[PDB]
Design a protein around this ligand. Sequence first.
Ligand code: ADP
Ligand code: MG
Length: 356
Amino acid sequence: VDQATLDKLEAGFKKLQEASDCKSLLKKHLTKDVFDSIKNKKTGMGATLLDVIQSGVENLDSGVGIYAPDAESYRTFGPLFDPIIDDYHGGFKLTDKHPPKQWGDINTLVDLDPAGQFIISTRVRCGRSLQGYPFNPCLTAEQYKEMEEKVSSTLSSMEDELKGTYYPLTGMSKATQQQLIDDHFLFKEGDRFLQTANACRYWPTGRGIFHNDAKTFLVWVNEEDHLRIISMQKGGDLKTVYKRLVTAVDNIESKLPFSHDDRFGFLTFCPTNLGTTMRASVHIQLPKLAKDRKVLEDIASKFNLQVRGTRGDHTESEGGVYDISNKRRLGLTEYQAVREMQDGILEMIKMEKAAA
Ligand SMILES: Nc1ncnc2c1ncn2[C@@H]1O[C@H](COP(=O)(O)OP(=O)(O)O)[C@@H](O)[C@H]1O
Ligand SMILES: [Mg+2]
């Protein structure tokens, strides 16, 4: 690790301290003991501690603040990753290991809001990393193209309900892109947290989205993770949404080789997405409970749920529509993760109905 990097790190560490109002897990778990312990470490691909915390240093409003430039980083900088992972996922010891993939009994899931007065739409997604390829910050332009080719070709083999087309971002009209994003289908452009983590190099090369004509099954290619496999639709039929996702992931997995870790389960770029990599969500309106975003968030937190704005991560709620989902993804099965969202949303709906 060169002197320049050390300077930026010491300065980075410095800045975090003087940020008396910073509430990121990076700030919380990067003690000087932790800091001095790994600051001189470097991975087999050159990833350094700066590559890990840079996003969190530059964006103090980060909730977490770190990313893994490569798989090795999870262990090389474990002293920082471990406590942050334990904290975020609500309990994941140094000795714990993520359980085997378990979709569970799909028949036990239910309709989330029969009368349809609160829920607008339901979505469940997973993330996957391609074996043979490192995470965004270590990828070259040629690798982005390679991966895009490999994934788009595999998806052309999907059949029946999952049959669809791949739409490259490179060459996509600004109007179409803007629509696909506004419709909540496509990942947005230029996320400051991802950018400062050097995860958006060579954009839009190798980036794109596959989706069936109904746009109920979609696959993001090369955004935050190599792949994001999504199932979504209007309403609250979580059962159908989940089943579609399960069908799609089982199928894609028999065709592509994905990185899985004995301890961390499926590997992803952000520590928040490890394990099941599952984020089950609903776009929902809860007039009484969501009078004050803070009150809604405190309520959601007790059900292990997370609140986001209508356009996703770090956005505001628009028209009273909130994105509420299971916060935890590692240390519990796929079934358990979707159930935390189902259970908490069913109850919050009950609380809203009983609110004055
Ligand atoms: N339940 C949902 N219904 C419709 N759109 C949703 C829903 N949940 C998330 N989204 C959309 O997914 C997109 C990405 O959001 P983000 O918060 O970054 O989630 P992700 O975990 O998939 O990366 C946004 O356009 C967001 O509005
Ligand atoms: Mg996202």
